[PDB]
Amino acid sequence: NAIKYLGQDYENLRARCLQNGVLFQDDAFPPVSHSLGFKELGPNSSKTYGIKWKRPTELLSNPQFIVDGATRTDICQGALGDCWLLAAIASLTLNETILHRVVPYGQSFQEGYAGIFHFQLWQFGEWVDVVVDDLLPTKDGKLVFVHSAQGNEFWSALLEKAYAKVNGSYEALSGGCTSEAFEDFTGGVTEWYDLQKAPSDLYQIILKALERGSLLGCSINISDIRDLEAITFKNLVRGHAYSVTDAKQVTYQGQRVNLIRMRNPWGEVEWKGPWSDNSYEWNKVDPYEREQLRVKMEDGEFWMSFRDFIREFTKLEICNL
Ligand SMILES: [Ca+2]
Ligand SMILES: [Ca+2]
């Protein structure tokens, strides 16, 4: 159904490992120092001290590939600057067709387990099947890189590992563009919008894009490297990729106001201005709209008015199907 990346056939390798009663060891990505990195995640980096590569079966008694669906809450960034990738994975979960292309069925830690997992990505104008063993970087029994809000869920950790494999190391994923990951999941071309010169119908473009299941992301541009990952006063993170997850209207002070929802791939650190989780604006909207849209939780997800969105964020990335 897809091209076998590096000649590695999932079905055949899984069958050979299951029948012989052995766990898969990926010869294309060894569980070593080079696979972590060379500088930021190099052997001399403090972030790598004490890292041990362990399979999820060694971490807890009941490891699961997917728990309560493969959703955006399953994407919580670790000790790596791969927000671009993670923002893309979070956006990917909002479209069932794209999610089920990238993450194949029948993968688990119970029946059919052989220490091997696979994902499908778009590479060189075609879908490719990438395999990985389940040895993941851990420190004191906890995942160092991406993890789920659900402690025993490992799909997102394994997808990020597949990306690290394709790119050579986990560090090769530090610093990038959301656009590339969007393209790796759809085979489309991402369009950039300058929010300082935003077209008059941008909200309508966003609404139609989200309804079709397109992948959307946003960020605040930086001029220098020292202001990278810097926090704004209203708690937004600069030079950091966010996933745009919804766009809905609410009745506020007798008028229908345009709102937009985004998610920080850290799974925490949210906007604290108007329309934020604990903001007073929600008290003035009717009970139903309040209960359907607002979720008071430190989950990385929040709402902003479209007026504030275009004043704060500087770039919007939309990848259509
Ligand atoms: Ca989940
Ligand atoms: Ca929230």
Side-chain angles (χ1 to χ4, degrees):
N1 294 278
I3 291 297
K4 320 300 168 184
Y5 184 67
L6 286 169
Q8 295 178 118
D9 192 292
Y10 172 76
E11 240 70 74
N12 274 107
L13 289 163
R14 182 201 175 204
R16 206 162 66 199
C17 287
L18 261 173
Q19 282 175 234
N20 292 104
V22 68
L23 296 174
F24 181 66
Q25 290 182 84
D26 194 2
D27 288 303
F29 199 55
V32 295
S33 67
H34 186 89
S35 289
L36 289 175
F38 51 93
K39 191 178 183 179
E40 182 191 335
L41 292 171
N44 299 143
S45 177
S46 62
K47 294 200 291 179
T48 67
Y49 296 173
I51 285 185
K52 284 176 179 62
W53 292 75
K54 291 176 182 177
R55 297 188 190 256
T57 51
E58 306 177 77
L59 299 179
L60 28 271
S61 188
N62 218 108
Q64 295 291 129
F65 187 63
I66 287 153
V67 186
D68 296 324
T71 70
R72 61 196 184 283
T73 55
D74 305 345
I75 294 94
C76 299
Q77 195 172 329
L80 181 58
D82 67 331
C83 52
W84 60 277
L85 167 59
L86 301 184
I89 299 171
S91 288
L92 158 86
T93 67
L94 295 169
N95 186 319
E96 298 291 326
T97 311
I98 305 302
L99 175 63
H100 293 287
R101 237 291 179 199
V102 179
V103 188
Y105 296 107
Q107 309 190 70
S108 71
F109 289 94
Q110 294 94 250
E111 286 69 55
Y113 179 64
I116 186 172
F117 292 92
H118 72 141
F119 299 91
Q120 302 204 165
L121 307 172
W122 187 267
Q123 196 188 225
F124 310 145
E126 60 187 339
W127 294 109
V128 299
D129 192 276
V130 185
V131 309
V132 279
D133 66 47
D134 62 340
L135 285 153
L136 291 158
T138 64
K139 185 182 182 183
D140 299 325
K142 289 184 178 181
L143 293 172
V144 180
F145 303 118
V146 82
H147 49 284
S148 178
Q150 178 71 39
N152 71 142
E153 189 177 35
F154 297 91
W155 78 275
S156 57
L158 292 158
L159 177 49
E160 183 194 52
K161 190 193 175 178
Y163 257 86
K165 175 185 169 165
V166 176
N167 291 271
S169 68
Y170 270 100
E171 192 175 336
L173 306 180
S174 249
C177 184
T178 318
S179 285
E180 300 197 312
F182 279 173
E183 290 153 12
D184 263 76
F185 296 148
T186 57
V189 187
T190 314
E191 298 175 83
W192 286 10
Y193 291 88
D194 189 330
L195 301 178
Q196 290 185 61
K197 287 185 179 66
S200 57
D201 65 329
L202 191 59
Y203 193 70
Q204 288 194 120
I205 292 169
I206 288 172
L207 278 177
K208 287 183 179 183
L210 282 159
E211 199 260 286
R212 278 185 165 165
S214 299
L215 308 186
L216 292 79
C218 60
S219 53
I220 304 171
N221 281 101
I222 47 161
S223 54
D224 41 80
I225 55 157
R226 47 189 63 182
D227 285 43
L228 185 44
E229 290 176 274
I231 317 162
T232 69
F233 195 73
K234 291 157 201 172
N235 218 39
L236 289 180
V237 192
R238 307 201 297 272
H240 179 72
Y242 283 76
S243 306
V244 171
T245 61
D246 209 355
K248 290 286 181 293
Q249 290 196 111
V250 289
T251 293
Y252 182 67
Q253 296 179 332
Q255 295 175 317
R256 294 293 284 173
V257 181
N258 292 157
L259 303 193
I260 184 164
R261 196 183 65 181
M262 25 282 138
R263 188 187 180 272
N264 183 343
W266 285 357
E268 54 183 30
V269 182
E270 312 186 0
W271 161 254
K272 295 296 174 182
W275 301 100
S276 57
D277 289 5
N278 306 314
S279 211
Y280 283 85
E281 286 81 15
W282 292 107
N283 300 144
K284 298 286 184 179
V285 307
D286 73 269
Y288 185 55
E289 295 187 315
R290 197 190 297 147
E291 286 160 43
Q292 265 260 282
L293 306 187
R294 188 198 60 190
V295 178
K296 279 203 184 174
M297 191 185 198
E298 183 74 76
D299 54 9
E301 199 162 68
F302 54 86
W303 291 88
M304 290 175 80
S305 65
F306 189 64
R307 209 232 85 168
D308 287 357
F309 175 78
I310 61 169
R311 187 198 65 226
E312 297 294 335
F313 287 93
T314 56
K315 187 163 82 174
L316 173 70
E317 299 179 55
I318 303 182
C319 187
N320 297 300
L321 249 289

